[PDB]
Design a protein around this ligand. Structure first.
Ligand SMILES: CC(=O)N[C@@H]1[C@@H](O)[C@H](O[C@@H]2O[C@H](CO)[C@@H](O[C@@H]3O[C@H](CO)[C@@H](O[C@@H]4O[C@H](CO)[C@@H](O[C@@H]5O[C@H](CO)[C@@H](O)[C@H](O)[C@H]5NC(C)=O)[C@H](O)[C@H]4NC(C)=O)[C@H](O)[C@H]3NC(C)=O)[C@H](O)[C@H]2NC(C)=O)[C@@H](CO)O[C@H]1O
Ligand SMILES: [Mg+2]
Length: 301
């Protein structure tokens, strides 16, 4: 389209924490990582602006030019709300109407075609669904992704109720993206990410029993935390390769990871937003995950 670009059927759009001082232009990340699709994190409620802002404090419009430049090389973005630290727009908004207004302001500022609701805290799912009914009516070209905590013994946790609510209310659910990380009782590896995927498959089949197996896998994305996780387990480069091969075999919809600015070597086992606490060279995980898109037609020089 004039500005917005197509996202591939099978895509890799890793998270960038837009608020970090190390932040590079998106086009530069595209060159370094090999992917021209990113999930931009995170929009939160700012008291100062009484509305949406990066990290809940940085002007919403700050990155408009960067997105325009990425679109010049055929790239595209998913805008993410929420994450580990609040306050979320959906928590602060008093009505679904106010919430929808905020979401629509973000869509219109970025000409967004895909939003990601990264819900890792207690919320009022009914209010969210009511807001999203307004958003999809007013902006019917915008896809919705739900990124949620997960565990290999259960699949989605309370996040499952969010998807159940969406389905019942008639809110589009284009992507369900479990965060295959930080289990604390068992390590963040490929085997456990695959167990999460299988559990989420069963969960989505229970909500949408009319969907074919292929339709369910297409709805699923997986998002690990690269290298050292907060719980000290390590999602290794070997894990990355195993997960990518599994994801290709199952023709799932998407992969992402936390995070682009962490794809650098760092002191062993240290948790940082600026490196991954392993010795793999710069951009090593990015290059492995890009193979997921390459299997299905993607090329970028
Ligand atoms: C099933 C279940 O219930 N499982 C839970 C499990 O959820 C719990 O662990 C938590 O898991 C969630 C995912 O479910 C983790 O959140 C993920 O993972 C990312 C890595 O931890 C997380 O990255 C952090 O994001 C912060 C913002 O939200 C970043 O804050 C930044 O801090 C900087 C200063 O240090 C500052 O300069 C920046 O401005 C600031 N950025 C913003 C936007 O405010 C932070 O840097 C970053 N951390 C790192 C190391 O990079 C993401 O938010 C989120 N990922 C995605 C894709 O959304 C969460 O972190 C886990 N918490 C813990 C404590 O492990 C688990 C533990 O409670 O219990 C299980 O049972
Ligand atoms: Mg929100």
């Amino acid at each position: 389209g004039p500005n917005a670009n197509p996202i591939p059927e099978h895509f890799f759009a890793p998270y960038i924490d837009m608020s970090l001082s190390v932040h590079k232009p998106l086009v530069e990340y595209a060159k370094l990582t090999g992917t021209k699709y990113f999930t931009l994190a995170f929009i939160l409620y700012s008291s100062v602006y009484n509305g949406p802002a990066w990290a809940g404090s940085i002007p919403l419009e700050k990155f408009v030019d960067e997105v325009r430049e990425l679109r010049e090389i055929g790239g595209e973005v998913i805008i993410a709300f929420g994450g580990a630290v609040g306050p979320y727009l959906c928590q602060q908004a008093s009505t679904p109407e106010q919430l929808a207004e905020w979401y629509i302001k973000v869509i219109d500022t970025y000409n967004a075609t895909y939003l990601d609701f990264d819900i890792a805290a207690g919320i009022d799912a009914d209010k969210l669904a009511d807001a999203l009914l307004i958003v999809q009516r007013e902006r019917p070209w915008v896809k919705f992704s739900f990124t949620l905590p997960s565990d290999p013994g259960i699949g989605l946790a309370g996040g499952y109720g969010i998807i159940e609510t969406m389905a019942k209310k008639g809110v589009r659910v284009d992507r369900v993206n479990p965060m295959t990380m930080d289990y604390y009782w068992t390590p963040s590896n490929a085997e456990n990410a695959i167990k999460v995927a299988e559990n989420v498959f069963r969960q989505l089949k229970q909500i949408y029993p009319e969907k074919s197996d292929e339709e369910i896998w297409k709805m699923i994305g997986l998002t690990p935390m690269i290298g050292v996780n907060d719980d000290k387990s390590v999602f290794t480069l070997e894990d990355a390769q195993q997960l990518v091969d599994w994801a290709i075999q199952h023709k799932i919809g998407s992969l992402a990871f936390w995070s682009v600015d962490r794809d650098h070597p760092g002191p062993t086992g240290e948790v940082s937003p600026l490196h991954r606490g392993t010795n793999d060279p710069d951009w090593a995980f990015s290059h492995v995950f890009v193979k997921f898109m390459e299997a299905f037609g993607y090329t970028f020089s």
